[PDB]
Amino acid sequence: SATHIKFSKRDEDGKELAGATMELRDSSGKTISTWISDGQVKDFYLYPGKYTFVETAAPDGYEVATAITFTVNEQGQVTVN
């Protein structure tokens, strides 16, 4: 019952942006994964629960984005909080 989630880190022209340090956290606060963006979509598979994508560092010339909180529900659908 794991739901596929596609994460894109982009610039304002809508192109994939490399160089951003990112964490995905669950509702407890547990860091599920930490990576640096590399210019492609990042795929995760997540069970029901509430999670947060957090930008911990932005590449030079770029501003740190506000964290994105989302929920995957028991029906497999995803919602942004």
């Binding site: 739901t3 596929h4 989630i5 596609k6 994460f7 894109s8 880190k9 982009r10 610039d11 304002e12 942006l17 951003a20 994508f53 930008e55 932005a58 590449p59 010339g61 770029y62 501003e63 740190v64 984005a65 994105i68 989302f70 995957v72 659908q77 995803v78 942004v80």
Partner: peptide, 12 residues
């Protein structure tokens, strides 16, 4: 599902 996060440009 798609999550899209944009990094805005800094000014100058």
């Amino acid at each position: 599902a798609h999550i899209v996060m944009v990094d805005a440009y800094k000014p100058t």
